[PDB]
Design a protein around this nucleic acid. Sequence first.
DNA 1: TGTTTGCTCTATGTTAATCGCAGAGCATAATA
DNA 2: TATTATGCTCTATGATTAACATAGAGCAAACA
Lengths: 91, 90, 92, 89
Amino acid sequence: GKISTDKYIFLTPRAYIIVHLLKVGKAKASEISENTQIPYQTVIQNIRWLLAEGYVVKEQKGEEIYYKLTDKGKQLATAELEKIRKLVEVV
Amino acid sequence: GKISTDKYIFLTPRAYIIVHLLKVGKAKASEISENTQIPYQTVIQNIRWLLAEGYVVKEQKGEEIYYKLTDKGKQLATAELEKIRKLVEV
Amino acid sequence: GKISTDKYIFLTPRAYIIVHLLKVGKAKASEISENTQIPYQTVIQNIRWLLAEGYVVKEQKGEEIYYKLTDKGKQLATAELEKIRKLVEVVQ
Amino acid sequence: STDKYIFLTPRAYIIVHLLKVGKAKASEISENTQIPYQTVIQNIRWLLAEGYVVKEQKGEEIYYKLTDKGKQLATAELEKIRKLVEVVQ
DNA sequence: TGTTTGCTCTATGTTAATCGCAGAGCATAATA
DNA sequence: TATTATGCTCTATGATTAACATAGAGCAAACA
């Protein structure tokens, strides 16, 4: 189909998640949602893509689960992030 | 919508496309493609939407069709170009 | 979550998907939906989880996208199928 | 991450147990299948509403059993199963 | 009489899962 | 040579509900 959004013209809802896993290092499904305001349903489906690809792993701390970046994760979250600013500088 | 995929971890084709328009001034259809590495079809319907919203404008400099950013698009470009550095600050 | 539903009283949507991948090898999300009569939206929702948990892997050559079971994938399957063969067994 | 209910549902065991036994207390089915009690009732609450099982209060001893409509569904769903298993080979 | 021990089911909030609609990424066939 | 239509894919996420855990609470026979 076509396009219609004011929320994600430039940044994906994923970027807000990976970034918040840098600022906080490790977070919880619910928690990510709140201090990012990205809908919970969206967060879980994304952290799930991150789990599969290895950018994140979970720490089941009791009745709760915690999602945190990895070597590969912190890597992408950093290097690929540079590409962001390396082209944001030019403007 | 199909916002974030594999090809697009951080930025949408809208990003690479608008930016490239700030860079080149007025690129054509395929031009934005070859540069941004984004598949043509994706590009063309994002431009179809940029026209719709008034961020881009059709231009007839020759037989072919070139695309430039309106000031409205530029205001969007710059404006959200800060939510990129801002959020990234951490 | 919601595991037991009017449509899933005994088997879950996973039970059907995994077994389709078993029988078929590689399959498109659609295909799996079309063969299990499980709504598509339910299908990727669980594929996406099977990817996270490393039971399933994505194979895509540009347009065509497939999904196969990993090795823990075929492991989970035969182990689950066991808890089942055992179930109905004790039921007789 | 419902690694607890991957192929089968809590409903699957609850019913299958009430076939093996016919009569059981809520606390019984729960203990005897490793299913949290609060899940067992909420399920029995549905099983009663859809009329698949029925209550029986002989004093302060409450028991649950399948209706005819229950065993019907029981041995029926167990067929969608029986079907699915063997087709894997 | 009343409190305790103990069993039972009820009230219900948090998270997680079914699965629906409106996207949107992109490839190809169709059309200007 | 480029745009739109067509259509198959996955995504964004919201509505409904289940899984199950915390805190009741109806109410038995057993202490004090």
